[PDB]
Design a binder for this molecule. Structure first.
Ligand SMILES: Cc1cc2c(cc1C)N(C[C@H](O)[C@H](O)[C@H](O)COP(=O)(O)OP(=O)(O)OC[C@H]1O[C@@H](n3cnc4c(N)ncnc43)[C@H](O)[C@@H]1O)c1[nH]c(=O)[nH]c(=O)c1N2
Ligand SMILES: NC(=O)c1ccc[n+]([C@@H]2O[C@H](COP(=O)([O-])OP(=O)(O)OC[C@H]3O[C@@H](n4cnc5c(N)ncnc54)[C@H](O)[C@@H]3O)[C@@H](O)[C@H]2O)c1
Ligand SMILES: [Mg+2]
Ligand SMILES: [Mg+2]
Lengths: 422, 460
């Protein structure tokens, strides 16, 4: 009967807001664990969808009947080893306070992961020794190329200038370690955690901790896949994130993607009747345009929740609705090491396969710009620095203008390419 | 060779140069470039650098681009380069070209509008002085960045619907004034009252409309910004009094924005249709970039209908950004937006084509003036302009970047007779705003009335 949306995450709240605007005479329920009194909040977490009976039951034991249901349960932090008190992974504001408390009392903290959480934390935290170990050859393999890593890593040497946290939780807490030494960091490439040894296990085996990374009896010691073993007061495992499919998959035969998300069609339908999904829980199975890709984020979640609400409204009106332009081109504009990072289309030339070419213009400690052109037509580009050319690169990508005549000079310093295609 | 190209080029007057016919394979009329002694050195260096480059591909020198526009069917007056002239797709940036709408062989060029449509600037006066705002400038900046959406991938706070978008595309500022996001004084102090009567929303492509629905009420990336400024100097006290700048240190705000996505899609849709028509109607053009359609042909009518729609959309975006700016000031200085005197000095566009009445060769004709990088500057007694500026002259708003001071000018009779009332828009993102405006004044095509220094920049 009443429309139901699951999650106080950006996708769920934005889906519920838009859906409430489309049907102001009917109520929407945002189940989760004002400006629109049409939306009520249940404040509880569901344990089982019942797709055959069209029902949801929460931890309250309350049963709900849905005409449409949008699943937006977000995603759990994956961990190197769950259950250990010395592992942390950021998920929610409660976990950010726990991280604050542990961090405000400690030194010698290890971070494992080359993903977005680690990329923020290595710049936000100061006054702890940061041991960094990454499974890849260079920093930021998810969001950057090898040449991009060399620009942003050279910045790392210099001194600092119940919904899940969104684009900028790092402003709402103060993160200073006891040492008070700004940006003392070491990076270990190709490494993975072999095992986690508590102090007691280390004492029994009589192994020796590697010396502090450079140009004492710690609580926990972690061994790498290399010959070097290091201790810490606690360890931050970024490890990526896994969709919260576990509490929903029980008892109903959802089709799951290779990333474990609920597969969704072009109208966001989950391959079960009447059930939609948006944000990290969903996985995009429709025919992708050449310059789009799905990476879990705040911007894509906001867009997916909007589109899901539009598609749900379409099915109730019986009307046909076309796909929203936000799925035509991927763009993410964000901050890493106090540098703007706008990645447009196939920024790392992903899915181009054999056919692609690279044009790069960069000034040391100023800006790094790279252009990916598969056939003389720009599929994607990486923009880093204070450059304001992001609209121009966006437009050239969605036009597919043949830039072959403009040659290698499309990124020459003296030509105002932004003015040229304004 | 450089010395061979030089034979086509001579000096008309202290601040203007001529491009004689034959500089490019076909030329209907001569070219002219308006320059100061300094910005001239740079305009010639572009041509010489291109000459040293054997078989050079793309990014042709600005002077050659002026000549390729002189090759176009129907050019009625000198192809003229304003001081801001620099490399631009098809037409060189700063170029005015005018074509007689009554001549049977005529041309509409998308490159002679730009890829955006109706990029412009809207200055707003405020009774507060620099000393009222300077202690709270950081609060006002955050309030503006909170109120005004900025940057790529951004989404507008103002609700937008497809029907209301089509109304705004057909109705321009009148739509914003009716909605409650603008005031009747905003309609008056606006170029053409912010209205394009030839606009047809049904001409705009569906993809352009898809780009338009979410982008409305957002500045975007690039040179689109809103900036808070304070008056530095008053060169024409009568003009300042007429526009409500009474004393130096008074606060104002510039909103530079235009068509976002809708324009680029409309322009690129036109270039594809023109490529078919150029072979059909035998429009022969010296560069492939210079797409061209006869005004009589459906392609020329279609782009001119689209251009007008994108202009109405761009004007609505400027009015929305103005509405948001007034709210941000009202919160920070704790009082009603009208009690702070947030009225508009002017609104003017630097990338549009318009049909205008000009007397050419002693006989008045209705001409389509293609100007990109160029702002309208109608003479002190022109009948079309605002009643308040019907004596002083239509204000020209000239926008800086990187903290360089902006200038507010006015239109002149000499500029009307020589340039069809065309003046600079702004400095290249090495030719300073100051050099460019000093030439437009020294050549008598503009009259500096105010000077302004930015203090807060709301970019993306
Ligand atoms: C530390 C950190 C840092 C960043 C980011 C994440 C994190 C954790 N992200 C990613 C981004 O925050 C995230 O991917 C999106 O907010 C996804 O939001 P969802 O809509 O999926 O909801 P979200 O993932 O927030 O869903 C959480 C909500 O789901 C509901 N829920 C969970 N389990 C449930 C159950 N069993 N039953 C019912 N309800 C349940 C609860 O209400 C809970 O509040 C990000 N993005 C970005 O663009 N820029 C950035 O800088 C960052 N940085
Ligand atoms: N501004 C941003 O882009 C930003 C910042 C923070 C978080 N986020 C997003 O939030 C989500 C969570 O961030 P995240 O960093 O956990 O996700 P992520 O997907 O970016 O992290 C994946 C990383 O985990 C590493 N990894 C996985 N298993 C590992 C193992 N066993 N040993 C070592 N390394 C291992 C991989 O090498 C990879 O670098 C992501 O979607 C991320 O994009 C966004
Ligand atoms: Mg502009
Ligand atoms: Mg523009």
């Amino acid at each position: 009967g009443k429309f139901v949306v699951v999650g106080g995450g950006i996708a769920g709240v934005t889906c519920a807001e838009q859906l409430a605007t489309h049907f102001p005479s009917e109520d929407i329920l945002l189940v989760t664990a004002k400006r629109f009194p049409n939306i009520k909040v249940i404040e509880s977490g569901v344990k089982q969808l019942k797709s055959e009976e069209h029902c949801i039951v929460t931890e309250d034991g309350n049963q709900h009947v849905y005409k449409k249901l949008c699943l937006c349960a977000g995603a759990k932090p994956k961990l190197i080893c769950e259950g250990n008190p010395y592992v942390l992974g950021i998920r929610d504001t409660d976990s950010a306070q726990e991280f604050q408390k542990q961090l405000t009392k400690a030194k010698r903290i290890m971070i494992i992961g080359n993903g977005g959480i680690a990329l923020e934390l290595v710049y936000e935290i100061e006054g702890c020794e940061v041991i960094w170990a990454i499974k890849d050859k260079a920093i930021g393999n998810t969001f950057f190329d090898a040449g991009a890593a060399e620009f942003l890593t050279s910045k790392l040497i210099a001194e600092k200038s119940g919904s899940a946290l969104g684009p900028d939780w790092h402003e709402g807490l103060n993160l200073k370690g006891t040492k008070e030494f700004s940006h003392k960091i070491h990076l270990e490439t190709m490494c993975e955690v072999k095992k986690i040894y508590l102090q007691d296990e280390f004492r029994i085996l009589k192994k020796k901790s590697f010396t502090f990374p450079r140009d004492e009896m710690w609580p926990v010691y972690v061994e790498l896949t290399n010959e070097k073993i290091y201790g810490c007061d606690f360890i931050v495992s970024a490890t990526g994130v896994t969709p919260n499919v576990e509490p929903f998959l029980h008892g109903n035969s959802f089709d799951l993607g290779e990333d474990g998300g609920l597969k969704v069609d072009d109208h966001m339908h989950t391959s079960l009747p009447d059930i939609y999904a948006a944000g990290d829980i969903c996985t995009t199975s429709w025919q992708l345009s050449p310059v789009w890709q799905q990476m879990r984020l705040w911007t894509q979640a906001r867009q997916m929740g909007w589109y899901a609400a539009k598609c749900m409204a379409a099915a109730s009106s019986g009307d046909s609705i076309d796909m929203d332009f936000s799925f035509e081109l991927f763009a993410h504009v964000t901050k890493f090491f106090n540098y703007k990072v706008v990645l447009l289309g196939k920024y790392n030339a992903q899915g181009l396969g054999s056919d692609h070419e690279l044009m790069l213009r960069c000034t040391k400690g100023r800006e790094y710009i790279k252009v990916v052109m598969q056939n003389g037509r720009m599929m994607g580009a990486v923009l880093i620095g204070e450059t304001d050319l992001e609209e121009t690169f966006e437009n050239l990508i969605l036009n597919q203008m043949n830039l072959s005549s403009y040659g290698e000079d499309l990124l020459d310093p003296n030509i105002d390419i932004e003015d040229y295609f304004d | 060779s450089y010395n061979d190209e030089l034979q086509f080029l001579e000096k008309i007057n202290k601040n203007c140069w001529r491009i004689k016919k034959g500089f490019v394979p076909n030329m209907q009329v001569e070219g002219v470039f308006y320059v100061n002694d300094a910005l001239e050195k740079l305009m010639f260096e572009e041509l010489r650098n291109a000459c040293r480059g054997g078989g050079v591909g793309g990014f042709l020198p600005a002077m050659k681009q002026i000549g390729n526009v002189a090759a176009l069917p129907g050019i009625v007056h000198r192809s003229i380069g304003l001081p801001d002239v620099h490399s631009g797709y098809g037409f060189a940036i700063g170029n005015m070209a005018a074509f007689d709408m009554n001549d049977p062989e005529a041309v509409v060029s998308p490159g002679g509008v730009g890829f955006d449509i109706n990029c412009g600037v809207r200055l707003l006066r405020t009774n507060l002085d620099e000393s009222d705002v300077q202690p709270v400038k950081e609060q006002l900046a955050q309030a503006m960045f909170d109120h005004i959406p900025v940057g790529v991938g951004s989404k507008g706070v103002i609700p937008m619907n497809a029907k209301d978008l089509e109304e705004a595309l057909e109705m321009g500022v009148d739509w914003s004034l009716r909605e409650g996001y603008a005031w009747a004084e905003d309609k008056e102090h606006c170029e053409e009252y912010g209205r394009m009567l030839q606009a047809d929303p049904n001409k705009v492509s569906a993809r352009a409309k898809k780009r338009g629905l979410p982008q409305l009420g957002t500045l975007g990336a690039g040179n689109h910004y809103a900036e808070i400024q304070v008056v530095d100097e008053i060169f024409n006290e009568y003009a300042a009094k007429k526009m409500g700048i009474d004393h130096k240190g008074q606060v104002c705000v510039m909103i530079h924005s235009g068509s976002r996505g809708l324009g680029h899609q409309v322009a690129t849709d036109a270039l594809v249709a023109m490529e078919k028509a150029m072979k059909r109607d035998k429009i022969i053009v010296n560069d492939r970039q210079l797409a061209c359609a006869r005004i009589a042909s459906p392609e020329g009518q279609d782009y001119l209908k689209g251009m007008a729609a994108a202009g109405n959309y761009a004007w609505v975006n400027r009015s929305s950004m103005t509405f948001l700016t007034r709210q941000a000031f009202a919160k920070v200085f704790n009082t009603t937006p009208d009690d702070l005197d947030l009225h508009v000095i002017y609104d003017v566009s630097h990338n549009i084509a318009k049909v205008e009445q000009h007397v050419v060769d002693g006989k008045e004709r209705t001409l389509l003036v293609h100007r990109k990088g160029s702002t309208r500057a109608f003479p002190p007694h022109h009948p079309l302009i605002a009643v308040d500026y019907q004596l002083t002259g239509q204000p020209v708003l000239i926008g800086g970047t990187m903290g360089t001071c902006s200038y507010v000018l006015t239109g002149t009779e000499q500029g009307m007779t020589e340039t069809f009332g065309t003046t600079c828009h702004g400095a290249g993102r090495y030719k300073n705003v100051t050099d460019v405006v000093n030439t437009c004044h020294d050549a008598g095509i503009s009259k500096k009335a105010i000077k302004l220094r930015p203090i807060a920049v709301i970019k993306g």
